């Protein structure tokens, strides 16, 4: 009931001091799908209250860890002290194909290893020497990206001058990114900075080149980062429809795909939150239209496939119909096997910018009801999008705190929680099944028809695991 949810929110917020309670009262809402303007119900994109155990990251995570990191042919330098690159090394399963250490460098950690002399006296000369060493030790790289950390932004190093000079001298593309963590409030400004860097330094290099042959069925996936192979599972469907995909942004993506993107006919954007800026810039500068699509679950995938096919001629529409006809029995069998064991169970979600609303349709396809969802750093537009996908009288939390999420789970009592590693063991100790929704719990892919089966199997294996019937000792 709506009144019950409101009373729960008030009881939860009763423990905070005055200013923190006033701030947090605006980040908790009860859903009403009839509302098209979520700013009248929820407030987003604001600084987190101090000392409340937020689960948000920094702009460095949004730039190096999200956007630039998956690009395999580049070498990414974590300019600054040692901690950031080490904590961000291989922690995200942005899958790629390549010979690591020779032509692919996604899982490797390049850093300047800042010391105190580099803070007091600077690090421009050290950065130039590092560029020389990178070139001499990894000759097969196709570019360098210098991701800034907090001290680099504080002490005012001129990484742009070093990038320009060494790019002129070595005939290589060096992209300086000012992704210092104290900038912004979360990873979203990291996304913005990374997209601006791509626009300024990489995108417009084949602007006066006509070597590429452009079929009238050229598409580019923007915002798919191949988490466990999701981008490949979407690309197989895209090509089966008859479409030629030139670029993948940025999971398993090369530099050449990025530079060939301005030649495509359609921009299929999966993660609007992280790539909407570059999509709009491409639409303004090159006139390439961009459309959003969802490949979570069979219903959403079929709808998205029909939507993409509607923008091409009749041959692509016929191939799309053939693709749905071919993949129908597989997902029907998946549903027949797994929906009976997952019918009626309730799911609470807390993920970052996109997945809290994208994976909902997959849950409804398995007879699952999402009783509460929320974002880490999404803006109000994402909330406008998600209010029409969530049911009536459902909790919505933005930048939830550990206490708030704990109390919400204690009162609501969902059958399953999908969130990150920073809350997995907390809820696993409360006897509640948990699924890692950032890393697919080291499983996947979940995109597409091939990934729907894995998604159903994983939800079954976690929700129905016998280990949840043994937490209470028989003598207690």
């Amino acid at each position: 009931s709506r009144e019950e949810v409101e009373s729960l929110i008030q009881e939860v917020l009763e423990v905070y001091p005055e200013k923190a309670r006033k701030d947090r009262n605006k980040h908790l809402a009860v859903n009403d799908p009839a509302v098209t303007q979520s700013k009248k119900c929820i407030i987003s994109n604001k600084k987190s209250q101090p000392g409340l155990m937020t689960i948000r990251g920094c702009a460095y995570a949004g730039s190096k860890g999200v956007v630039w990191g998956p690009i395999k042919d580049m070498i990414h330098i974590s300019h600054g002290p040692v901690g950031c690159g080490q904590y961000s090394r291989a922690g995200r399963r942005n899958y790629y194909i390549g010979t690591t250490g020779v032509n692919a460098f996604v899982t490797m950690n390049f850093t300047s290893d800042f010391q105190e002399k580099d803070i007091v006296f600077g690090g421009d000369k050290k950065l130039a020497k590092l560029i020389d060493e990178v070139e001499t030790l990894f000759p097969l790289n196709k570019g360098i990206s210098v991701q800034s950390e907090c001290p680099i932004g504080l002490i005012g190093d001129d990484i742009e001058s070093v990038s320009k000079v060494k790019g002129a001298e070595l005939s290589k593309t060096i992209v300086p990114v000012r992704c210092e963590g104290f900038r912004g409030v979360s990873q979203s400004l990291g996304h913005h900075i990374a997209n601006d860097a791509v626009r300024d330094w990489v995108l417009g290099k084949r602007d006066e080149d006509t070597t590429f042959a452009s079929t009238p069925y050229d598409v580019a996936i923007i915002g798919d980062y191949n988490i466990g192979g999701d981008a490949w599972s979407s690309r197989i469907l895209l090509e089966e429809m008859g479409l030629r995909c030139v670029a993948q942004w940025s999971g398993d993506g090369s530099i050449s795909e990025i530079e060939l993107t301005p030649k495509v006919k359609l921009n299929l954007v999966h993660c609007y939150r992280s790539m909407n800026y570059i999509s709009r810039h491409m639409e303004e500068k090159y006139g390439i239209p961009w459309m959003e699509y969802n490949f979570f679950g069979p219903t959403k995938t079929i709808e998205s496939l029909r939507a993409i096919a509607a923008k091409f001629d009749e041959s692509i529409q016929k191939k799309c119909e053939e693709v749905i006809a071919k993949y129908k029995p597989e997902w029907e069998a998946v549903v027949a096997k797994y929906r009976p064991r997952l019918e009626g169970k309730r799911v609470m979600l807390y993920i970052g910018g996109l997945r809290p609303r994208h994976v909902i349709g997959a849950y409804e396809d398995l007879g699952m009801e999402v009783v509460g969802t929320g974002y880490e750093f999404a803006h109000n537009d994402d909330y406008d999008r998600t209010m029409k996908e969530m049911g009536d009288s459902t909790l919505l939390y933005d930048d939830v705190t550990g206490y708030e999420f704990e109390e919400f789970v204690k009162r609501i009592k969902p059958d399953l929680i999908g969130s990150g590693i920073k809350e997995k063991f907390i809820f696993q100790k409360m006897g509640i099944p948990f699924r890692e929704m950032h890393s697919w719990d080291y499983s996947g892919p979940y995109h597409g028809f091939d990934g729907f089966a894995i998604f159903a199997r994983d939800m079954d294996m976690t929700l129905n695991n016998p280990c949840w019937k043994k937490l209470q000792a028989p003598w207690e």
Partner: protein, 271 residues
């Protein structure tokens, strides 16, 4: 066709006062000019605006949550003769980071385009003690192209100008920022003009002007006004107008040549 000049020098040598009187003189003859004060204590626009407290970029950004939510109109303030005034702002002394303040303020002025296609001059009044890259913000690429150092015939200003030239030489080699001249504010000790000319020749630059120590400016600073706003028939007003004319008519831009402390010994043992 918009020219960008930075005003550097030692602390207390008269950067802000001379800069504001110079831009007032420039507005007198009728070119639109902007002032950007990179001083955390926010005194670079006091005389033009006739106000003690204004809305700096950082306090307004703190009120508005983030710098991304700031509006140029809330921080851009006109003054005498259409001169536009903006203050970087910063913390009270002893806390935080002034240099990051200048960095963020200049980045904001560059992303939210503040250099409209109407300005003939943009001055950057920089802090006296540049101790980090943030205070070297005004003199990077796509930024101030001319640098003027304010000095005087004392060991203080000579040594400080030499160190400031040492700092500039790296940006001059990396970029295209040059020394356009040296302004000396007289302390009336002895043989000031000859010593300033000697140091300028040693570095490779010119003495832009000699502005004598006139108490009238102090009186003007009593009521938050420039000398131009005071009785314009005063001699110092004509001196500032002549300085503005010479600044408009400047051609010589060189890469400065820093000198060793022994050269300063030789120069000191010359008068």
């Amino acid at each position: 066709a918009m020219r960008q000049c930075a005003i550097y020098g030692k602390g207390g040598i008269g950067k802000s006062t001379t800069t504001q009187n110079l831009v007032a003189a420039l507005a007198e003859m009728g070119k639109k000019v902007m002032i950007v004060g990179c001083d955390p204590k926010a005194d670079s626009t006091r005389l033009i605006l006739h106000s003690k407290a204004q809305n700096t970029i950082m306090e307004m950004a703190a009120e508005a949550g983030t710098v991304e939510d700031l509006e140029l109109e809330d921080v851009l303030k006109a003054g005498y003769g259409g001169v536009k005034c903006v203050e970087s702002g910063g913390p009270e002394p002893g806390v935080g980071c002034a240099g990051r303040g200048v960095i963020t303020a200049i980045n904001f002025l560059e992303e939210e385009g503040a250099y409209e296609d109407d300005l003939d001059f943009v001055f950057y009044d920089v802090l006296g003690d540049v101790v980090c890259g943030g205070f070297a913000m005004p003199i990077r690429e796509n930024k101030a192209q001319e640098i003027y150092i304010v000095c005087s015939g004392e060991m203080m200003a000579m040594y400080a100008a030499n160190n400031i030239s040492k700092g500039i030489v790296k940006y001059a080699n990396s970029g295209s920022v040059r020394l356009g001249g040296l302004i000396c504010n007289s302390r009336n000790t002895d043989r000031e003009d000859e010593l300033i000319i000697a140091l300028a020749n040693k570095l490779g630059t010119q003495m832009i002007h000699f502005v004598p120590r006139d108490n009238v400016v102090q009186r003007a600073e009593i009521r938050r006004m420039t000398v131009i706003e005071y009785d314009p028939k005063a001699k110092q007003a004509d001196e500032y107008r002549a300085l503005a004319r010479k600044v408009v008519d400047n051609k010589l831009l060189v890469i400065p040549n820093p000198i060793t402390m022994d050269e300063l010994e030789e120069l000191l043992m010359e008068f």
